[PDB]
Amino acid sequence: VXPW
Amino acid sequence: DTQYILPNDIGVSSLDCREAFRLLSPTERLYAYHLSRAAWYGGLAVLLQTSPEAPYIYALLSRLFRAQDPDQLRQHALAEGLTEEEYQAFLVYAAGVYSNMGNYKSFGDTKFVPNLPKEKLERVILGSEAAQQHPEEVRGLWQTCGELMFSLEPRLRHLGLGKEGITTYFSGNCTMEDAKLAQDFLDSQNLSAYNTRLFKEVDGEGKPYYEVRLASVLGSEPSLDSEVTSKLKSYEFRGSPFQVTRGDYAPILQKVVEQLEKAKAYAANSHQGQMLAQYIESFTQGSIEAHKRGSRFWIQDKGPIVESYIGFIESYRDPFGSRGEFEGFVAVVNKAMSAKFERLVASAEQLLKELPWPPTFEKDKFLTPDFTSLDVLTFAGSGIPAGINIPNYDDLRQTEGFKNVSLGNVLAVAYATQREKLTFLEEDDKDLYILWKGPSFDVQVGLHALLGHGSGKLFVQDEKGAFNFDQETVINPETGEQIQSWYRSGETWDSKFSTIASSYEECRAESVGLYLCLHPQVLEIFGFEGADAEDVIYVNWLNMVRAGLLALEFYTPEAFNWRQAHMQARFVILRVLLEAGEGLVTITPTTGSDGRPDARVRLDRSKIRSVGKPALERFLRRLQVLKSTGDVAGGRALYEGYATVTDAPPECFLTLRDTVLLRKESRKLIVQPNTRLEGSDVQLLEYEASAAGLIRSFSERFPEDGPELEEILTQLATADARFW
Ligand SMILES: [K+]
Ligand SMILES: [Mg+2]
Ligand SMILES: [Zn+2]
């Protein structure tokens, strides 16, 4: 799993 | 309107990684070169996983820009009557298509079209140099993809199952019912959806036949024996015919495995070599199991200088939530920035104990997980994240361990903001925001990756009832009773929690981040003692509530659907903190300095611990209990209840959404470098931080076989054309  | 176009002054940042590359040894450089080539090759498949016209648009753009670079093409376009702003809009559009590997935003799942008249762009394309060199190919590509490149018909605006959306993970005639039946079949067959797509056709009667196509180099022909070759047959499932095939994106993955084999020669240790062999197996046969074994060997490779991962990893853009989009990154460790995260790992096992659920709902043994800060050289696919927790195989995450990764040169590209663009904050808040955003983000990302995704025990039952926990002694804190819900064989987190799984897990991880950020030991791990940890905490929470407001841009009210997992998660956290009342967070609509509707977010620093922490603790316990029991019913109840967007007073979120859109800022595109092999050495090629720079980065990206990749994509597109 993992914004700006 | 502007919702479905990229603005001509969209920010473009260049990935900064000359120093990390210059650190690398010659062997490490050739290793990263071949891995980057494999990743770039595989990222082309995202085009096929995005929209039916995306491969054609890519082929057309890359042909156009091979014939003429942006500056050559400008002269033609302006001689053909375009304006500089229209040509700039075309450049921005091409750069968007390149940066997303498709004509839909990877962050938002919305289509974007070129911001200029279609007839003028036709004048440009048909008069171009590539058109004069290949009239048949260019004219065919244009007639095939042009109006779809521009059409904003309402069913084309968003990615999604059914008729009101667009997806190529399924055929056009597929609905959520078809995806649910496919997922039940896949669970019954212990075949993971990650590297699969689903196509539905009908016979003369109208009876639906289902094809579950696996992504593989090899097709449906006799190859060396695998667990995959037995599965290539027809089945009947609840009266429906299913056909498991493979050979999807076959020549693309062929290039990928070529480059992976070449990288295998320059591997540092046997862990990397075996993980690469297993990746080759996974991509050639179609085995998610081979990818699992490669990921196991990869977890075993601790602290390498060139970190990497590749495959059909994340399941964000599958409208059902189980199939994986292709990605692949190559990065260099940054030991100085990784120091703080290894520090966070040092006290991580003892940090988990503070989480608001009993150790019976926590992983059995804490495995010392690798956590590095990385500098990216390549991140192929549709988007570059800030950090990753991988692998997503929860069995591996519970037995062997996992890796946490913080992309440093991506965090740095995203750190910069201007005062004007910081919307919905009062001037007193903006200064603390500017001063503390970066360090607060280090904190939040560390907590999100290590203690968020890295925490949680899923209760799995065997086929012989062998619970991985103690059914007799483990008690459910929300009911006081023993455990009654759990996962079975073949059932995974994505499998049971389909459309909300990504957003739900993300919400849990970032609630963990917000919660454990009050812990002063954590704040001193990042070197923030009480003199400044105060402000880093307040900034983390203010950023969270502001993100919860801003998330309304990523909500389709007509479909009652959330288009982005993290933003839905942050809206959920905002509604949760609004729920406790007591004047903690307050969204108040105002009128802006420019005379347009604005809003203001007020967050009280004092009530963060007295009001915010109890609500977050309650919420985290609910989330974790429902996740560990796999209670899809109650989990959906909770999450889809908080994620509900309503115009109810006082918040009036639906009216706020118009303000959030009317003051939205487009996410910047990121230019990535290329690597070249001068026979002996490896050199790094950087590019201007512009639309033309990104275009050039993709024109020089495939020097050996670019025109062949264009035709591979065109062929794979035309073959499946009947599905949409
Ligand atoms: K998912
Ligand atoms: Mg659809
Ligand atoms: Zn995450």
Tokens of B73: 């093409």
3-state secondary structure B345-400: HHCHHHHHCCCCCCHHHCCCCCCCCEEEEEEEEEEECCCCCCEEEECCCHHHHHHC
Q: Which of A2, A3, A4 sits opposite B390 (nearest CB)?
A: A2
Chain B residues in contact with chain A using a Cβ-Cβ cutoff of 8 Å: 107, 313-314, 316, 383, 385-386, 388-390, 392, 410-411, 414, 453, 502, 505-506, 509, 566, 667
Cβ atoms < 10 Å from Cβ of B149: 23
Chain A residues in contact with chain B using a Cβ-Cβ cutoff of 8 Å: 1-4
Closest to B573 (Cα-Cα) out of B602, B536, B546: B546
Identity of the amino acid at B331: A
Coil, helix or strand for B185?
helix
Where does chain B break, by residue before each gap (C–N > 2.5 Å)? none
Residues 6+ apart with CB under 8 A from B628: B361, B456, B457, B458, B459
Nearest ligand (C-alpha, residue B512): 3
Tokens of B243: 């056909």
Q: What are the residues whose beta carbon lies below 5 Å from ligand 1 (ion)?
A: B 315, 321, 494, 501-502
Closest to B108 (Cα-Cα) out of B455, B551, B437: B551
How far, in Å, from the CA of B565 to the mean position of ligand 3?
A: 9
Tokens of B184: 């039940």
CA pair distance B246, B457, nearest whole angstrom? 33
CA pair distance B109, B323, nearest whole angstrom? 15
CA pair distance B423, B663, nearest whole angstrom? 8
Using alpha carbons, list the distances in angstroms from residue B287 to B271, B301, B696: 19, 21, 36
CA pair distance B198, B242, nearest whole angstrom? 10
Residue of B nearest to A3 (CA): B385
CA pair distance B597, B475, nearest whole angstrom? 51
The answer to whether the CB of B451 falls within 8 A of the CB of B516 is yes
Helix, strand, coil distribution of chain B in percent, nearest 5: 50, 15, 35
DSSP state at residue B425? -
Which residue matches tokens 């998330």? B551
CA pair distance B627, B456, nearest whole angstrom? 8
Closest to B329 (Cα-Cα) out of B275, B393, B377, B260: B377
**For this experimental structure, what is the resolution in angstroms?**
2.7
How much is the CA Rg of chain B, to the nearest whole Å?
Answer: 25
Nearest ligand (C-alpha, residue B450): 3
Cβ atoms < 10 Å from Cβ of B478: 13
CA pair distance B44, B383, nearest whole angstrom? 13
> How many residues are listed for chain B in this entry?
724
Extract long-range pairs of B417-421: CB within 8 Å, 24+ residues apart: B421/B665
Q: Do A2 and B388 touch (CB under 8 A)?
A: yes
Residue of A nearest to B510 (CA): A2
| Angle of the B530-550 helix axis to the B565-579 helix axis, nearest 10 | 110
Give me the numbers of helices (H) and strands (E) for chain B, helices first please: 30, 17
Using alpha carbons, list the distances in angstroms from residue B235 to B243, B244, B659: 6, 8, 51
DSSP state at residue B592? -
Widest CA span in chain B: 80
Residues of chain B contacting A4 with CB distance shorter than 8 Å? 385-386, 410-411, 414, 667
The answer to whether the CB of B717 falls within 8 A of the CB of B52 is yes
Instruction: Kindly compute the dihedral angle of the four CA atoms of residues B72, B73, B76, B81, in this order, to the nearest 10 degrees.
Output: -140
Identity of the amino acid at B612: G
Tokens of B566: 């993290």
CA pair distance B472, B75, nearest whole angstrom? 77
Which helix (H) or strand (E) element contains residue B333?
strand B325-333
Tokens of B255: 């290039």
Domains of chain B: 2-13+41-162+687-723 (no CATH), 176-250 (3.30.70.2600), 426-662 (no CATH)
The answer to whether the CB of B25 falls within 8 A of the CB of B266 is no
Residues of chain A contacting B389 with CB distance shorter than 8 Å? 1-2
DSSP string, B95-122: HHHHHHTSSB-TTT-BB---SS-HHHHH
CB half-sphere exposure, B53, CA atoms < 13 A = 22
CA pair distance B566, B495, nearest whole angstrom? 19
Q: Which sign does the torsion angle of CA B256, A3, B324, B624 carry?
A: positive
Please give the interface size between A and B, counted as residue pairs whose CB atoms are below 8 Å apart: 29
How far, in Å, from the CA of B323 to the mean position of ligand 1?
A: 8
CB half-sphere exposure, B185, CA atoms < 13 A = 23
| Angle of the B54-67 helix axis to the B84-100 helix axis, nearest 10 | 120
Q: Give the distance, in angstroms, between the CA of residue B89 and the centroid of all CA atoms in the same chain.
A: 26
DSSP H helical ranges for B461-500: 493-497
CA pair distance B13, B710, nearest whole angstrom? 27
Instruction: Kindly compute the dihedral angle of the four CA atoms of residues B599, B604, B608, B611, in this order, to the nearest 10 degrees.
Output: -90
How far, in Å, from the CA of B396 to the mean position of ligand 1?
A: 17
Name the phi and psi angles at B682, rounded to 5.
-120, 130
Coil, helix or strand for B583?
coil
Q: Do A3 and B392 touch (CB under 8 A)?
A: no
Which helix (H) or strand (E) element contains residue B711?
helix B706-719
CB half-sphere exposure, B96, CA atoms < 13 A = 29
Nearest ligand (C-alpha, residue B502): 1
In a mutagenesis test of the A interface, which of B403, B566, B665, B666 is the best target, namely the one with the most A β-carbons within 10 Å?
Answer: B566
Q: Do B506 and A4 touch (CB under 8 A)?
A: no
CA pair distance B459, B630, nearest whole angstrom? 8
Which residues is B388 bridged to in the sheet? B405
Identity of the amino acid at B490: G
CA pair distance B533, B536, nearest whole angstrom? 5
Coil, helix or strand for B485?
coil
How far, in Å, from the CA of B110 to the mean position of ligand 2?
A: 13
Name the phi and psi angles at B219, rounded to 5.
-95, -150
Using alpha carbons, list the distances in angstroms from residue B264 to B258, B259, B476: 10, 9, 48
Coil, helix or strand for B589?
strand
Q: Do B505 and A4 touch (CB under 8 A)?
A: no
CA–CA min distance B64, chain A (Å): 32
Q: Do A2 and B389 touch (CB under 8 A)?
A: yes
Which helix (H) or strand (E) element contains residue B495?
helix B493-497
Identity of the amino acid at B506: E
Instruction: Kindly compute the dihedral angle of the four CA atoms of residues B632, B637, B640, B643, in this order, to the nearest 10 degrees.
Output: -130
Coil, helix or strand for B705?
coil
Cβ atoms < 10 Å from Cβ of B4: 16
Using alpha carbons, list the distances in angstroms from residue B300 to B275, B367, B472, B723: 9, 12, 34, 41
How far, in Å, from the CA of B164 to the mean position of ligand 2?
A: 6
How far, in Å, from the CA of B621 to the mean position of ligand 2?
A: 36
Q: Do A4 and B414 touch (CB under 8 A)?
A: yes
Cβ atoms < 10 Å from Cβ of B685: 12
Q: Do A4 and B314 touch (CB under 8 A)?
A: no
Using alpha carbons, list the distances in angstroms from residue B75 to B128, B131, B301, B525: 10, 15, 51, 56
Identity of the amino acid at B113: V
Extract long-range pairs of B631-635: CB within 8 Å, 24+ residues apart: B631/B485, B632/B496, B632/B497, B635/B497, B635/B500, B635/B504
CB half-sphere exposure, B182, CA atoms < 13 A = 31
CB half-sphere exposure, B653, CA atoms < 13 A = 21
The answer to whether the CB of B589 falls within 8 A of the CB of B419 is no
CA pair distance B136, B674, nearest whole angstrom? 31
CA pair distance B347, B344, nearest whole angstrom? 6
Which residues is B331 bridged to in the sheet? B307, B376
Q: What are the residues whose beta carbon lies below 5 Å from ligand 3 (ion)?
A: A 1; B 509
Name the phi and psi angles at B338, rounded to 5.
-75, -15
CA pair distance B664, B567, nearest whole angstrom? 14
DSSP string, B280-328: HHHHHH--HHHHHHHHHHHHHS-S-SEEEEEEEEE-SSSSSS-S-EEEE
Closest to B36 (Cα-Cα) out of B308, B305, B294, B278: B308
CA pair distance B546, B706, nearest whole angstrom? 43
DSSP state at residue B483? P
Name the phi and psi angles at B673, rounded to 5.
-75, 170
Tokens of B100: 């997303």
Residue of B nearest to A2 (CA): B388
Cβ atoms < 10 Å from Cβ of B129: 16
CA pair distance B599, B548, nearest whole angstrom? 13
How far, in Å, from the CA of B513 to the mean position of ligand 3?
A: 10
Which residues is B209 bridged to in the sheet? B201
Q: Do A2 and B313 touch (CB under 8 A)?
A: yes
How far, in Å, from the CA of B454 to the mean position of ligand 3?
A: 10
Residues 6+ apart with CB under 8 A from B84: B78
Residues of chain B contacting A1 with CB distance shorter than 8 Å? 314, 388-390, 392, 453, 502, 505-506, 509
How far, in Å, from the CA of B589 to the mean position of ligand 3?
A: 30
CA pair distance B623, B604, nearest whole angstrom? 25
Cβ atoms < 10 Å from Cβ of B656: 19
Using alpha carbons, list the distances in angstroms from residue B345 to B451, B454, B474: 9, 11, 28
Q: Which of B385, B390, B392 sits opposite A3 (nearest CB)?
A: B385
Identity of the amino acid at B425: L
CA pair distance B262, B509, nearest whole angstrom? 37
Q: Do B386 and A1 touch (CB under 8 A)?
A: no
> How many residues are listed for chain A in this entry?
4
CA pair distance B58, B349, nearest whole angstrom? 47
Identity of the amino acid at B379: F
Nearest ligand (C-alpha, residue B175): 2
Q: Do A1 and B505 touch (CB under 8 A)?
A: yes
Tokens of B143: 């007639």
Which residue matches tokens 């001068």? B678
